[PDB]
Design a protein around this ligand. Sequence first.
Ligand SMILES: [O-][O-]
Ligand SMILES: [Cu+2]
Ligand SMILES: [Cu+2]
Ligand SMILES: [Cu+2]
Lengths: 73, 273
Amino acid sequence: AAPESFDEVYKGRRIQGRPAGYEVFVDGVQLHVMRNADGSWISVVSHFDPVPTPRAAARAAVDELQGAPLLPF
Amino acid sequence: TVRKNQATLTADEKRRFVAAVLELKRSGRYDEFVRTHNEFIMSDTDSGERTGHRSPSFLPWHRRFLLDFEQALQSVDSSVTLPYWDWSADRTVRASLWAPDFLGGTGRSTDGRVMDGPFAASTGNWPINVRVDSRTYLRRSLGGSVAELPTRAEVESVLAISAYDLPPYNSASEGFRNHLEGWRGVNLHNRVHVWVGGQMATGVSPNDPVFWLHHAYVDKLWAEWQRRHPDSAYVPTGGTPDVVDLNETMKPWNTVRPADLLDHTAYYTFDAL
Ligand SMILES: [O-][O-]
Ligand SMILES: [Cu+2]
Ligand SMILES: [Cu+2]
Ligand SMILES: [Cu+2]
């Protein structure tokens, strides 16, 4: 069962998630994310630190970026 | 070829290692290691094909990737070998690893930027090109996102585990491989990535030269596990969908198998094992 979609402004960045497994965008730029077998999530910019949900992975990416644009993959 | 503890290098050996790394960067060869690694970080999945990570071939895959990098360094300076970082012993930001004559230190607080050492963006010698975060300077926050590196006692608890790996051969596994990788348990290898921060916390983690020293010590711990469990060996041993079995070849090379990489002494020895 995929997580629900989301859309919010987090730390001044628009983050969106939607089932596709699942896609996340930071100001319209897609961020690679992945689900682990225990149901936690990671992203390519926080790969080694599992968080509970795709929104948590999007927010960890915004925290990592410190305001910088994301580049596509 | 002897792989030495970074803490033990002479000033000359440090100088030669740094110069060879900077030359691989200048020539364009370095960044393709970063690109290959990110491709596997993004493609290895728990429920599908998995080769470089979150799977039993994590260890032989990184052993071959490090051999490819070491051979590239030796094509520039034949005296250079990959050193390893025993993060259980050299565990603070004051370690000589992080001095300006070796890897440089932590990043400043406002933007994570490394301000000293040979890889600092201000040198003009270490552009971050293969990247997801669009910033183009090396970043670190040592000890920022997780308070402590693993200890020798925690490493020994992992080396004590008898089974190399276990079904379902992914991030949910019990067993040595996944405890060393760190997705279960007290967490060795993943935690060190989180502890360094900056590009080391990302899929483009080989952008930081410490990547190779971290993986050279994870590789040493595999060799230590083998000597503790001579009776135990790589699994699985044939017929496993989506997982590299012992005698199956591995991407991207296709010409090598885990079986060919179990015995490191074919390729190098350690200063002490
Ligand atoms: O895993 O690097
Ligand atoms: Cu890797
Ligand atoms: Cu994908
Ligand atoms: Cu790693």
